[PDB]
Amino acid sequence: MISLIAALAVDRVIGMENAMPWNLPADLAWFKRNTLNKPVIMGRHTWESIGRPLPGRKNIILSSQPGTDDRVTWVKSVDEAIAACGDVPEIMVIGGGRVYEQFLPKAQKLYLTHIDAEVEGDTHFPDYEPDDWESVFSEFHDADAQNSHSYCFEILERR
Numbered sequence: 001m002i003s004l005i006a007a008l009a010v011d012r013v014i015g016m017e018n019a020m021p022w023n024l025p026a027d028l029a030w031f032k033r034n035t036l037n038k039p040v041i042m043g044r045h046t047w048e049s050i051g052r053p054l055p056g057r058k059n060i061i062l063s064s065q066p067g068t069d070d071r072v073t074w075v076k077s078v079d080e081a082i083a084a085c086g087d088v089p090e091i092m093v094i095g096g097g098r099v100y101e102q103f104l105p106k107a108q109k110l111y112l113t114h115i116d117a118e119v120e121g122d123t124h125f126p127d128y129e130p131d132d133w134e135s136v137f138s139e140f141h142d143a144d145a146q147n148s149h150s151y152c153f154e155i156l157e158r159r
């Protein structure tokens with residue numbers, strides 16, 4: 001089972017200049033909680049944007065070029081990435097935009113954080129078909145002293 005996890009600002013913006021244009025520790029905590037002890041698949045630009053391995057998860061990096069760090073696993077196609085996860089119950093695809101596009105059609109779940117932030121972007125989440133998806137969990141949070149925007153955790157499951 002393949003899932004996507006992402007945080008989306010207004011207009012589905014997910015990134016700008018190889019970074020996320022917000023800082024929401026509560027959302028990072030949600031990401032960790034939903035990815036720990038699962039394999040994570042990411043594209044090379046996201047690997048560079050994170051800048052180090054995510055602990056406690058098998059990190060699988062897509063790139064057409066040879067890998068440059070044996071602390072993570074490098075693969076050259078979607079099907080190789082899936083295979084490298086092995087027999088696990090849930091594979092987490094953690095972006096970025098190009099990777100989400102390719103995995104969305106295989107995905108059965110989406111973990112989306114909807115952030116109430118206006119931010120210029122150069123990367124978006126796919127313009128997915130809402131009719132394909134059932135919202136099964138929603139949890140809204142107002143901004144607080146640690147988290148400058150309001151945000152909503154949503155889980156959707158393919159109908």
Ligand SMILES: NC(=O)c1ccc[n+]([C@@H]2O[C@H](COP(=O)([O-])OP(=O)(O)OC[C@H]3O[C@@H](n4cnc5c(N)ncnc54)[C@H](OP(=O)(O)O)[C@@H]3O)[C@@H](O)[C@H]2O)c1
Nearest residue numbers: 006007015018019043044045046063064095096097098099
């Ligand atoms: N808000 C969020 O939830 C979130 C999540 C993740 C990332 N981001 C942001 O998204 C941006 C990065 O996204 P992006 O779309 O630019 O890049 P990306 O999807 O992270 O990486 C794309 C690269 O992955 C490799 N790749 C992808 N598909 C491949 C395939 N089928 N076979 C082989 N290699 C493949 C290629 O590397 P090569 O060029 O080496 O071949 C490609 O250039 C950053 O701004 C980042 O901060 C945001």
Ligand SMILES: Nc1nc(=O)c2nc(CNc3ccc(C(=O)N[C@@H](CCC(=O)O)C(=O)O)cc3)cnc2[nH]1
Nearest residue numbers: 005006007027028029031032050054055094095113
């Ligand atoms: N909901 C969501 N939010 C994001 O920020 C996010 N980010 C990525 C890719 N980028 C990143 C960047 C940093 C960290 C990171 O440092 N995570 C730590 C957080 C520890 C904590 O704050 O509790 C981790 O161990 O997961 C993860 C993913 C992919 N999907 C996402 N999905």
Ligand SMILES: [Mn+2]
Nearest residue numbers: 116117149150
């Ligand atoms: Mn805001």
Ligand SMILES: [Mn+2]
Nearest residue numbers: 128129130131
């Ligand atoms: Mn429509």
Ligand SMILES: [Mn+2]
Nearest residue numbers: 135138154156
């Ligand atoms: Mn919804």
Ligand SMILES: [Mn+2]
Nearest residue numbers: 137138139140
């Ligand atoms: Mn709700």
